[PDB]
Design an enzyme around this catalytic site. Structure first.
Site, PDB file in Angstrom:
ATOM      1  CG  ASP A 176      -2.019   1.192   1.259  1.00 10.24           C
ATOM      2  OD1 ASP A 176      -2.046   1.792   0.146  1.00 10.24           O
ATOM      3  OD2 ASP A 176      -2.701   1.079   1.908  1.00 10.24           O
ATOM      4  CB  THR A 177       2.139   3.260  -2.711  1.00  9.29           C
ATOM      5  OG1 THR A 177       1.032   3.499  -3.645  1.00  9.29           O
ATOM      6  CG2 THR A 177       2.854   2.021  -3.492  1.00  9.29           C
ATOM      7  N   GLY A 178      -0.009   4.213  -0.636  1.00  8.16           N
ATOM      8  CA  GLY A 178      -0.671   5.366   0.062  1.00  8.16           C
ATOM      9  C   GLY A 178      -0.819   5.179   1.902  1.00  8.16           C
TER      10      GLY A 178
HETATM   11  C1  LIG Z   1     -13.967  -0.841   7.655  1.00  8.27           C
HETATM   12  C2  LIG Z   1     -14.280  -1.904   6.331  1.00  8.27           C
HETATM   13  O1  LIG Z   1     -14.117  -1.083   5.148  1.00  8.27           O
HETATM   14  P1  LIG Z   1     -13.086  -1.661   3.881  1.00  8.27           P
HETATM   15  O2  LIG Z   1     -13.647  -1.311   2.529  1.00  8.27           O
HETATM   16  C3  LIG Z   1     -11.292  -0.996   4.156  1.00  8.27           C
HETATM   17  O3  LIG Z   1     -10.334  -1.685   4.154  1.00  8.27           O
HETATM   18  C4  LIG Z   1      -9.268  -1.156   3.727  1.00  8.27           C
HETATM   19  C5  LIG Z   1      -8.853  -0.010   4.461  1.00  8.27           C
HETATM   20  C6  LIG Z   1      -7.817   0.880   4.246  1.00  8.27           C
HETATM   21  C7  LIG Z   1      -6.849   0.334   3.189  1.00  8.27           C
HETATM   22  C8  LIG Z   1      -5.713   1.055   2.756  1.00  8.27           C
HETATM   23  C9  LIG Z   1      -6.274   2.741   2.450  1.00  8.27           C
HETATM   24  N1  LIG Z   1      -7.002   2.952   1.384  1.00  8.27           N
HETATM   25  C10 LIG Z   1      -8.310   3.335   1.342  1.00  8.27           C
HETATM   26  O4  LIG Z   1      -8.922   4.162   2.328  1.00  8.27           O
HETATM   27  O5  LIG Z   1      -8.989   3.032   0.249  1.00  8.27           O
HETATM   28  C11 LIG Z   1     -10.462   3.114   0.227  1.00  8.27           C
HETATM   29  C12 LIG Z   1     -10.871   3.792  -1.268  1.00  8.27           C
HETATM   30  O6  LIG Z   1     -10.678   2.567  -2.076  1.00  8.27           O
HETATM   31  C13 LIG Z   1     -11.202   1.456  -1.259  1.00  8.27           C
HETATM   32  O7  LIG Z   1     -10.216   0.442  -1.409  1.00  8.27           O
HETATM   33  C14 LIG Z   1     -10.234  -0.375  -0.074  1.00  8.27           C
HETATM   34  C15 LIG Z   1     -10.436   0.688   0.902  1.00  8.27           C
HETATM   35  C16 LIG Z   1     -11.163   1.787   0.094  1.00  8.27           C
HETATM   36  C17 LIG Z   1      -4.749   3.630   1.937  1.00  8.27           C
HETATM   37  O8  LIG Z   1      -4.376   2.658   1.185  1.00  8.27           O
HETATM   38  C18 LIG Z   1      -3.883   4.157   3.191  1.00  8.27           C
HETATM   39  N2  LIG Z   1      -4.336   5.154   3.919  1.00  8.27           N
HETATM   40  C19 LIG Z   1      -5.456   5.733   3.432  1.00  8.27           C
HETATM   41  C20 LIG Z   1      -5.275   7.287   3.019  1.00  8.27           C
HETATM   42  C21 LIG Z   1      -5.148   8.093   3.925  1.00  8.27           C
HETATM   43  C22 LIG Z   1      -4.675   7.205   1.589  1.00  8.27           C
HETATM   44  S1  LIG Z   1      -4.819   4.632   5.639  1.00  8.27           S
HETATM   45  O9  LIG Z   1      -4.988   3.215   5.548  1.00  8.27           O
HETATM   46  O10 LIG Z   1      -5.955   5.354   6.186  1.00  8.27           O
HETATM   47  C23 LIG Z   1      -3.479   4.683   6.536  1.00  8.27           C
HETATM   48  C24 LIG Z   1      -2.278   3.891   6.567  1.00  8.27           C
HETATM   49  C25 LIG Z   1      -1.334   4.065   7.601  1.00  8.27           C
HETATM   50  C26 LIG Z   1      -1.462   5.161   8.184  1.00  8.27           C
HETATM   51  O11 LIG Z   1      -0.144   5.344   8.946  1.00  8.27           O
HETATM   52  C27 LIG Z   1       0.170   6.752   9.117  1.00  8.27           C
HETATM   53  C28 LIG Z   1      -2.026   6.109   8.047  1.00  8.27           C
HETATM   54  C29 LIG Z   1      -3.306   5.840   7.207  1.00  8.27           C
HETATM   55  C30 LIG Z   1      -7.175  -0.692   2.153  1.00  8.27           C
HETATM   56  C31 LIG Z   1      -8.352  -1.431   2.672  1.00  8.27           C
HETATM   57  O12 LIG Z   1     -12.672  -3.339   3.900  1.00  8.27           O
HETATM   58  C32 LIG Z   1     -12.518  -3.960   2.666  1.00  8.27           C
HETATM   59  C33 LIG Z   1     -12.301  -5.414   2.812  1.00  8.27           C
END
Ligand SMILES: CCOP(=O)(COc1ccc(C[C@H](NC(=O)O[C@H]2CO[C@H]3OCC[C@H]32)[C@H](O)CN(CC(C)C)S(=O)(=O)c2ccc(OC)cc2)cc1)OCC
Lengths: 99, 99
Positions: free
Chosen positions: B25-27
């Site tokens: 996860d590059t984000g």
């Molecule tokens: C609650 C249940 O719902 P869910 O849909 C979400 O499952 C996820 C959640 C987060 C990620 C990574 C973030 N992607 C994401 O939100 O994508 C969203 C939009 O597209 C969809 O794809 C899957 C999740 C939707 C993103 O890659 C990284 N950040 C988001 C943003 C700030 C870029 S983060 O995870 O909030 C984060 C990581 C590490 C940190 O350390 C500082 C801080 C924050 C992947 C999957 O379950 C699916 C089976």
């Protein structure tokens, strides 16, 4: 470009004549943009992440220019804390992870 | 390996003798793993995303074996909806985005 990951992978994107920065995000299925004015009809939708869920407006067939390269796809708009370019648009710019 | 982004970029990871799948996860600035049992000492932290915030346990200097290659770094454990490998570990496996 090839880009390393020591800093957040931001690219400049242009969408409906507006410029912004967005994170190239291999962990995001969908592209999500911060509060912006986009024309046309939309579909109400909710997206899920870390911390729970967020209401967004779904817009289809939106032209996005990411590092100048043009792509068309679905863009979700809403109170996201970062503009994210997800895999729906990344596949169109030939994006690969190499490791 | 070089991986395209038509499907989610899951890799096998082994952490404290346990196997799981995790999204490259590059984000993600940080690595976050689902509720698993790690030893031993930790510091309380909260991480923020789409949908708000989530309380995590911060574990330092954890050995992670990602696609077989060994890296050491900080792992946050908590109610994440996906195991996420973030840039803190992606840099150590020489990960790059190519588009
Ligand atoms: C609650 C249940 O719902 P869910 O849909 C979400 O499952 C996820 C959640 C987060 C990620 C990574 C973030 N992607 C994401 O939100 O994508 C969203 C939009 O597209 C969809 O794809 C899957 C999740 C939707 C993103 O890659 C990284 N950040 C988001 C943003 C700030 C870029 S983060 O995870 O909030 C984060 C990581 C590490 C940190 O350390 C500082 C801080 C924050 C992947 C999957 O379950 C699916 C089976």
């Amino acid at each position: 470009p090839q880009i390393t990951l020591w800093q957040r992978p931001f690219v400049t994107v242009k969408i409906a004549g507006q410029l912004m920065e967005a994170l190239l995000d291999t962990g995001a299925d969908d592209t999500i943009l911060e509060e912006m004015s986009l024309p046309g009809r939309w579909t109400p939708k909710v997206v899920g992440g870390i911390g729970g869920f967020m209401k967004v407006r779904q817009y289809d067939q939106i032209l996005v220019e990411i590092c100048g390269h043009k792509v068309i796809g679905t863009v979700l708009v809403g109170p996201t804390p970062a503009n994210i370019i997800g895999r729906n648009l990344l596949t169109q710019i030939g994006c690969t992870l190499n490791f």
